């Protein structure tokens, strides 16, 4: 886009096209028709949420103390 | 009871308390970079809106790709949930708002299609039920425009074919470190900016193919950028809500450790009185 | 003098005391179990000159006597809140807690900072070591707290990324083989490994070990300037610079 | 005391006293009571303590180092000694770190001779007043590290401005410390202390720097410390 | 029993290891997620009414609960027990090949082969 005293290039982040797009769309539709796991990148959250899960688990803690709920 | 195991019980809560603290600290560091790429997402979109609003001045009426209003019969929702838990009600409050707003639509006899983004949302609507037409997940801390093209292309196409009359984005807007707000903005039917639309100038581009063709491409490029900066912002809200809700978990654990320490000291005494008493009374 | 396992003395005394049908206490240990370790370790002390002169009957005059105690206590599961350990800690001026998971994790002289402590400390230390050891004591206990956070955090910033490097580099350096004692010239690699991080350069750990080994010899090659330190144990502004050159000079040998 | 004076009775460690009573009670073959203490510790305490009091001819006032076994103030050795104490002075290591050097922690340090009317209302409220501005400053101390200090409301960052200042004031230089230090240090009445603290926290001296109130006596001593800067 | 109980012992033991993640289920990928479900079912299988002893035809049930996820289909634990009382009685349909396994107290391969088919033949019912 060139205009009076300014020109900007609005770049695509990946090669676009009706062929490549319908490919990504069909994929998105498919992944929804079949609940299936997929890893998010975060490992810091992974092994931490796991340790947290094991450490929290099987504690009779809420029973040992006398708490209302 | 039993001072023996109340210890390991305490030590256990101590550990989890130490973990949630680490999580709080990690989400803290992640937090700054999150707002940065949230800011870097702004130029592309705002510049493109000026070009749209401008060239939308003349060419729009003949054929709106998405400019004009029309009778609502169906509505779409691109929902931005997070790929990771442990962040308070960031997701629940969003979903709860969405559900409540979907209800006002279904009561009017209109259906609601959902494009899902992020694991936690896919799981939630897998349970409470919903019409998820498409999804993308597992982006985590590395969202991209690439991965959004799929779900957005599906929702867009539905609007083109008349199967959708409105299209919303649903995500948390990041106000400040201790305040994220569940928001449902309407993107497409383009709304309505006086700022970008009211003013105009003498000059005009020379479009290679018809300007009608570009007004379409730009309109689609824009809607995707909207959804991306909705995701990228929701992500910066996650890091905050997390490090905040994690400080809470660290303090909850600390309170349990104080209560346990009492229950322990009680058993510690009971144990030492009985052992002493049975020995001396046993001797007799 | 060192009492190897006077926690075993306790159970031994408990045996005799229990057979004598005497009334028991906290952990079946007799009532005066504290008084046992109490009067034993109170015996160890530095006694003044006047006392030495009176006892000796004018024999010795200027000299001052002292007996240093070094009692050992065994703890179950690392629990020190236990009865006997509590008593002797309540008696001795300070303690050197050797942590388990440190020891059997390679890092052998497994002293746990932050929980170890020399109650008298500073005064007892040599004039030179006094200056070099200052920070190491505390800053090393922080590396451990931070390495603990490091488990879950990958992609940490360079500022803490460097502190962690310095941490594991000094912890590696601070550890040593068994039967090899070390001159008061140990502060050479103690001080100046931490002083300007002469090991921070060619840091990477596997070298941090062999580095100490050879630095220990290249100083031999001019040990009069060094042995001066072993005799007086003093540190001076000049002495500092003299040392500095020894390491800068070492940055041309290996 | 009978001599007519008021006196101070320091007890190196009252805990060791009661514990010693257990060894004896054990040697005399007396039975074990709760948690293995002597059945006579309820009485052994009541006599040691009840003898230190203020007669109409004199008075003994006692400060005793306490030891709480396993940090359980429920243990009889503390739990008994506690039903006798009329005040508690808590030395915090973190309060020492900063530099304020009667290392007393203004909270956690209790005294049932202030709680009441009995000191007087003015002292009591000034006291309670500092116990709030000083505490309110903590809650905001982590809503500040994590967030902007600026988004803290007017009255609250003025609270964090005043509290920041009272805590530097209630520091002090001791005479016995002149050998250690070099600074004379002094002795301030109850009245100058109330005036000084009440004066600070209820709109005043806000113009003085925080440094002003380190390590000096009555408030005017601090006011002159401001000019010297 | 000695043969087919070996599968349960380890299947149970793995569920013991992942029990902690049950709170955080759905956070884990399908790989270990399926092992958790198998464990929940196999422990939901090992539970009986008071006065109802089993016939060593419990063999059929237990054994070939482990063999294949004949429980893996149609898992959800609510049905994972009503299937038990249903496999149990459709065997009394053709039980000559069953009192046989009962008396002999033994199995090799033919009997396994038959067993495999008895369940495949099963899910053509209920």
How would DSSP label each residue in chain B?
--HHHHHHHHHHHHHHHHHHHHHHHHHHHHHHHHHHHHHTTHHHHHHHHHHHHHHHHHHTTT--SS-S----SEEEEEEE--S---STTHHHHHHHHHHHHHHHHHTTT-EEEEEEESHHHHHHHHHH--EEEEEE---TT---HHHHHHHHHHHHHHHHTTS-SEEEEEEEEEEETTEEEEEEEE-SS----HHHHS---S-----SS-HHHHHHHHHHHHHHHHHHHHHHHHHHHHHHHHHHHHHHHHHHHHHHHHHHHHHHHHHHHHHHHHHHHHHHHHH-
Residue from the list A3, A27, A48 with its beta carbon closest to the beta carbon of B22: A48
Instruction: Name every chain A residue with its beta carbon within 8 A of the beta carbon of B84.
Output: 40, 42, 45, 49
Residue C230 maps to which CATH number?
Answer: 1.20.150.20
- Using alpha carbons only, how large is chain E's radius of gyration in Å? 15
The two tokens of residue B275 are: 């052992």
Cα separation values, C57 from B236, C51, C61, Å: 82, 10, 9
DSSP state of E124: S
Smallest Cα–Cα separation from B178: which of B255, B245, B93?
B245
Domains observed in chain B: 1-59+206-284 (1.10.287.80), 60-205 (3.40.1380.10)
Report the C-alpha gap between B34 and B31 in whole angstroms. 5
Name residues 8-37 of chain C within 8 A of B (Cβ).
21, 23-26, 28
Which amino acids of B are annotated catalytic?
A: 87
Q: What is the DSSP string of D57-115?
A: S-EEEEEE----GGG-TTSHHHHHHHTT-SB---B-HHHHHHT-SS-B-TTT--BTTTS
- Torsion angles phi and psi, residue B250, rounded to 5: -70, -35
Q: Does B12 contact A8 at a Cβ distance shorter than 8 Å?
A: no
Contact B22 C23 (CB under 8 A): no
For an interface test with A, the pick among B9, B10, B11, B16 (most A C-beta atoms closer than 10 Å) comes out as B16
Residue C88 DSSP SS3 = helix
For the record, the structure tokens of B272 come out as: 């030492």
Please indicate if any CB of chain B lies within 8 Å of the CB of D147: yes
With beta carbons less than 8 A apart as the criterion, state whether D145 and D153 touch. no
Provide, as residue numbers in chain C, all residues whose Cβ is less than 8 Å from the Cβ of A48.
Answer: 152
* Terminal-residue alpha carbon distance, chain B: 29
Chain C residue numbers touching A43 (CB-CB < 8 A): 154
Query: Which element (helix H / strand E) includes C65?
Result: strand C65-66
D27 and C26 within 8 Å at the Cβ level: the answer is: no
Residue by residue, DSSP assigns chain D as: -TTS-EEEEEETTHHHHHHHHHHHHHHTTPPP-GGG--TTHHHHHHHHHHTSS--SS-EEEEEE----GGG-TTSHHHHHHHTT-SB---B-HHHHHHT-SS-B-TTT--BTTTSSSSS-HHHHHHHHHHHHHHHHHHHTTHHHHSS-GGGS-HHHHTHHHHHHHHHHHS----STTTTTS--------HHHHHHHHHHHHTT-STTS-GGGGSS-SSHHHHHHHHHH-
Q: Which residues of chain E make contact with A49, given a CB cutoff of 8 A?
A: 24, 27
Instruction: State whether the Cα torsion B248-B249-B254-B260 is positive or negative.
Output: positive
Q: Which tokens in the block code for residue D5? A: 């004076």
Give the 3-state secondary structure of residue C227: helix
Query: Could you tell me if C148 lies within 8 Å of chain B, comparing CB atoms?
Result: yes
Lookup: tokens for C37: 């370790």
- CB < 8 Å from C in window 66-105 of D: 70
Its sign, for the CA torsion D63, D69, D70, D71, is negative
Distance from CA of D157 to the nearest CA of B (A): 18
Geometric angle at alpha carbon C3, from C1 and C5, rounded to 5°: 160
Distance CA E4, CA B44 (A): 64
Q: Measured between alpha carbons, how far is B233 from B231 in angstroms, rounded to an integer?
A: 5
Q: Resolution reached, in Å?
A: 3.3
Bridge partners, B131 (sequence order): B113
Residue C223 is given by DSSP the state: -
CB B170 within 8 A of CB B189: no
Q: Shortest Cα distance from D35 to chain C (angstroms)?
A: 8
**B123 CB near a chain E CB, below 8 Å?**
yes
The answer to whether E20 contacts A37, with C-beta atoms less than 8 Å apart, is no
Residue C36: closest CA among C4, C11, C58: C11
- Residues in chain C within 8 Å Cβ distance of D22: 31
Chains D and A touch (3+ CB pairs under 8 A): no
Size of interface C-D (CB pairs under 8 A): 16
What is the rounded CA–CA span in Å between residue D128 and residue B213? 74
- Interface check for A49 against chain C (CB to CB < 8 A): the answer is no
Please say whether the dihedral angle defined by the alpha carbons of residues B81, B87, B89 and B93, taken in this order, is positive or negative: negative
Q: How far is C155 from chain B (nearest CA, A)?
A: 10
For B146, counting Cβ atoms within 10 Å of its Cβ (0-12 exposed, 13-18 middle, 19+ buried), the class is middle
Domain of C231, in residue numbers: 126-254
How far off is chain D from C1, nearest CA to CA, in Å? 28
Alpha helix locations (H) across chain C?
6-19, 33-41, 49-56, 83-91, 100-103, 127-150, 158-173, 186-195, 205-218, 224-232, 237-250
Residues contacting D96, CB < 8 A, separation 6+? D103
- Assigned token pair, C93: 């001026």
* H-run or E-run covering E79: helix E79-82
Q: Which domain holds residue D208?
A: 114-229
Distance of alpha carbon B127 from alpha carbon B137, whole angstroms: 17
Q: How far is CA D14 from the centre of its chain?
A: 18
Paired tokens of B206: 């020379």
Determine the number of helices (DSSP H) and then strands (DSSP E) in chain A: 3, 2
**CB contact (8 A) between residue B22 and residue C28:** no
Q: Determine contact, residues B17/B254, Cβ cutoff 8 Å.
A: yes
CB contact under 8 A, B20 and A39: no
Place of tokens 């990477």: C204
Query: What distance in Å separates the CA atoms of residue C72 and residue B109, rounded to the nearest whole number?
Result: 82
Round to whole Å and give the CA distance between D181 and B123: 67
Q: What is the DSSP letter of E119?
A: H
Q: How far apart are CA D185 and CA D175, in angstroms?
A: 6
Structural contact between residues B119 and E25, judged by C-beta atoms closer than 8 angstroms: no
Query: Does the beta carbon of C157 lie under 8 angstroms from any beta carbon of chain B?
Result: yes
Give yes or no for a contact between D197 and D125, defined as CB atoms under 8 angstroms apart.
Answer: no
- Please tell me whether residue C25 adopts helix, strand or coil conformation: coil
Name the nearest CA neighbour of C234 among C181, C182, C185, C197: C185
B22·C25 Cβ contact <8 A:
no
Q: Identify any residues that bridge with C95 across adjacent strands, giving them in sequence order.
A: C117
Are E46 and E84 in contact by the 8 Å Cβ rule? The answer is: no
Residue C196 DSSP label = S
Taking the CA atoms of residue C174, residue C175, residue C180 and residue C186 in that order, the dihedral angle to the nearest 10 degrees is -10
State which residue of chain D sits closest to C25, comparing Cα positions: D36
For residue B91, the distance in angstroms to the closest alpha carbon of chain E comes to: 15
Query: Which residues 64-93 of B have a C-beta within 8 angstroms of E?
Result: 85
User: Which residues in chain E have their CB less than 8 angstroms from residue B85's CB?
Assistant: 24, 27
Give the helix ranges, DSSP H, for A1-69. 18-33, 44-56, 61-64
Shortest Cα distance from B83 to chain E (angstroms)?
9
In angstroms, rounded to a whole number, what is the distance separating the alpha carbons of residues D109 and C205?
49
DSSP annotation of C222 reads G
User: Using CA atoms, how far apart are residues B275 and B279, in angstroms rounded to an integer?
Assistant: 6
Q: Name, in order, each residue with C-beta under 8 angstroms of A44's C-beta and a sequence gap of 6 or more.
A: B26, C152, C153, C154, C155
Q: Is E35 on the interface with A (CB under 8 A)?
A: no
Residues of chain B in contact with residue D36, where contact means CB-CB under 8 angstroms, are 272-273, 276
Chain D residues within 8 A of B178 when measuring between CB atoms? 146-147
Please report the sign of the dihedral spanned by the C-alpha atoms of residue B246, residue B248, residue B253, residue B254. Answer: positive
Please state, in angstroms and as integers, the Cα–Cα distance from residue E45 to each residue in E66, E79, E80, E85, E122, following that order.
10, 11, 7, 11, 18
Do A and B touch, 3+ Cβ pairs within 8 Å? The answer is: yes
Residue in chain A nearest C152 by alpha carbon: A44
Q: How far is CA E80 from CA C65, E22, E25, in A?
A: 83, 18, 19
Q: Which residues are bridge partners to B117 per DSSP?
A: B80, B136
CA atoms of C3 and B174, how far apart (whole Å): 64
D23 alpha-carbon distance from chain centroid:
33
In 3D space, the residue among E43, E112, E110, E54 whose CA is nearest the CA of residue E87 turns out to be E54
- Hey, what long-range contacts does C83-87 have (CB within 8 A, 24 or more apart)? C83/C26, C83/C27, C83/C29, C83/C33, C84/C7, C84/C10, C84/C27, C84/C29, C84/C33, C84/C37, C85/C7, C87/C33, C87/C34, C87/C37, C87/C38
Q: Which residues of C touch B279 (CB under 8 A)?
A: 24, 28
Contacts of C151 in chain A (CB under 8 A): 47
SS3 C98: strand
Neighbours of chain E (3+ CB pairs under 8 A): A, B
Nearest Cα neighbor of D77 from D11, D159, D13 is D13
The secondary element (H helix, E strand) that includes residue E21 is: none
Among all chains, which residue has been given the structure tokens 């009685």? Answer: E89
Q: How far is CA A55 from the centre of its chain?
A: 25
Give dist(CA B211, CA D172) in Å, integer. Answer: 80
Task: Residue window 233-272, chain B: list those with CB within 8 Å of chain D.
Answer: 243-244, 247, 261-262, 265-266, 268-269, 272
Instruction: Please check whether residue B160 is in contact with residue A25, taking contact to mean a CB–CB distance below 8 angstroms.
Output: no
Q: At what angle do helices B42-59 and B211-283 cross, to 10 degrees?
A: 150
Q: Which member of C119, C144, C161, C220 is catalytic?
A: C119
Terminal-to-terminal C-alpha distance of chain D? 47
Q: Is the separation of the CB atoms in C190 and C132 below 8 Å? A: yes
- Answer whether D1's CB lies under 8 Å from D56's CB: no
**Cβ contact E45:E61 at 8 Å:** yes
Testing the interface with B: which of E23, E24, E25, E26 to mutate, by most B Cβ within 10 A? E26
Quick one: which H or E segment has residue C47? strand C46-47
């Amino acid at each position: 886009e060139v205009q009076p005293g300014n020109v900007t290039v609005l770049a695509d982040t990946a090669i676009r096209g009706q062929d490549l797009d319908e490919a990504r769309a069909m994929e998105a539709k498919r992944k929804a028709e079949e609940h299936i796991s997929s890893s998010h990148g975060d490992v810091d959250y992974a092994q931490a949420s796991a340790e947290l899960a094991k450490a929290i688990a099987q504690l009779r803690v809420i029973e040992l103390t006398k708490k209302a709920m | 009871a039993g001072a023996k195991e109340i210890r390991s019980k305490i030590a256990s809560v101590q550990n989890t308390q130490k973990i949630t603290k680490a999580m709080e600290m990690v989400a803290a560091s992640k937090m700054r970079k999150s707002q940065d790429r949230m800011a870097a997402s702004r130029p592309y979109a705002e510049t493109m809106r000026k070009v749209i609003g401008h060239l939308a001045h003349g060419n729009l009426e003949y054929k709106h790709p998405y400019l004009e209003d029309r009778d609502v019969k169906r509505v779409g929702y691109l929902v931005v949930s997070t790929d990771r838990g442990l962040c308070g009600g960031l997701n629940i409050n969003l979903f709860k708002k969405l559900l409540a707003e979907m209800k006002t639509w279904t009561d009017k006899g209109v259906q609601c299609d959902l494009a899902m983004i992020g694991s936690k949302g896919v799981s939630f609507f897998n349970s409470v039920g919903g019409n998820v037409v498409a999804q993308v997940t597992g982006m985590g801390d590395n969202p991209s425009l690439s991965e959004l093209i799929g779900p957005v292309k599906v929702m867009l196409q539905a609007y083109d074919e008349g199967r959708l009359d409105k299209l919303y984005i649903v995500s948390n807007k990041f106000i400040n470190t201790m305040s994220q707000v569940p928001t449902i903005s309407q993107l497409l039917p383009l709304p309505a900016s006086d700022d970008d639309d009211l003013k105009h100038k003498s000059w005009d581009y020379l479009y290679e193919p018809d300007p009608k063709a570009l007004l379409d491409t730009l309109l689609r490029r824009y809607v995707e950028s909207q959804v991306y900066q909705g995701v990228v912002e929701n992500l910066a809200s996650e890091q905050a809500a997390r490090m905040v809700a994690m400080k809470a978990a660290t303090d909850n654990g600390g309170s349990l450790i104080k209560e346990l320490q009492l229950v322990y000291n009680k058993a510690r005494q009971a144990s030492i009185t009985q052992e002493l008493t049975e020995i001396v009374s046993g001797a007799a | 003098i060192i009492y190897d396992d006077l926690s075993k003395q306790a159970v031994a005394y408990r045996q005799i005391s229990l057979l004598l049908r005497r009334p028991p206490g906290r952990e079946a240990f007799p009532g005066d179990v504290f008084y046992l370790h109490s009067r034993l370790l109170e015996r160890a002390a530095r006694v003044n000159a006047e006392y030495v002169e009176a006892f000796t009957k004018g024999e010795v005059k200027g000299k001052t006597g002292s007996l240093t105690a070094l009692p050992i206590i065994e703890t179950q599961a690392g629990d020190v809140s236990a009865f006997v350990p509590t008593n002797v800690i309540s008696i001795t001026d300070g303690q050197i807690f050797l942590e388990t998971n440190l020891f059997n994790a390679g890092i052998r002289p497994a002293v746990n900072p932050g929980i170890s402590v020399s109650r008298v400390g500073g005064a007892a230390q040599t004039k030179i070591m006094k200056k070099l050891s200052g920070g190491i004591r505390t800053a090393l206990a922080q590396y451990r707290e931070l390495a603990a956070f490091s488990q879950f955090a990958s992609d940490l910033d360079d500022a803490t990324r460097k502190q962690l490097d310095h941490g594991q580099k000094v912890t590696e350096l601070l550890k040593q083989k068994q039967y090899a004692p070390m001159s008061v010239a140990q502060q050479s690699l103690v001080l100046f490994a931490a002083e300007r991080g002469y090991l921070a350069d060619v840091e990477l750990s596997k070298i941090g070990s062999f580095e100490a080994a050879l630095l220990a010899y290249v100083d031999r090659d001019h040990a009069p300037l060094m042995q001066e330190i072993n005799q007086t144990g003093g540190y001076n502004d000049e002495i500092e610079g003299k040392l500095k050159g020894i390491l800068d000079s070492f940055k041309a040998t290996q | 005391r009978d001599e007519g004076r008021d006196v101070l009775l320091f007890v190196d460690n009252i805990y060791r006293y009661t514990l010693a009573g257990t060894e004896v009670s054990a040697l005399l073959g007396r039975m074990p009571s709760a948690v293995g203490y002597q059945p006579t510790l309820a009485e052994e305490m009541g006599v040691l303590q009840e003898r230190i009091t203020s007669t109409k001819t004199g008075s003994i006032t006692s400060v005793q180092a306490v030891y709480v076994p396993a940090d359980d103030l429920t243990d009889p050795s503390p739990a008994t000694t506690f039903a006798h104490l009329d005040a508690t002075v808590v030395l915090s290591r973190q309060i020492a770190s900063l530099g304020i050097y009667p290392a007393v922690d203004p909270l956690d340090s209790t005294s049932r001779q202030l709680d009441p009317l009995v000191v007087g209302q003015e002292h009591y409220d000034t006291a309670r007043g500092v116990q709030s501005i000083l505490q309110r400053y903590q809650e905001l101390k982590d809503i500040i590290a994590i967030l902007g200090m600026d988004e803290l409301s007017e009255e609250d960052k003025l609270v964090v401005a005043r509290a920041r200042k009272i805590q530097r004031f209630l520091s002090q230089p001791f005479f016995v410390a002149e050998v250690f230090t070099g600074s004379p240090g002094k002795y301030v009445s109850l009245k100058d202390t109330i005036r000084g603290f009440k004066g600070i926290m209820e709109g005043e001296y806000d113009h003085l720097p925080e440094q002003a109130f380190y390590m000096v006596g009555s408030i005017e001593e601090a006011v002159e410390k401001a000019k010297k800067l």
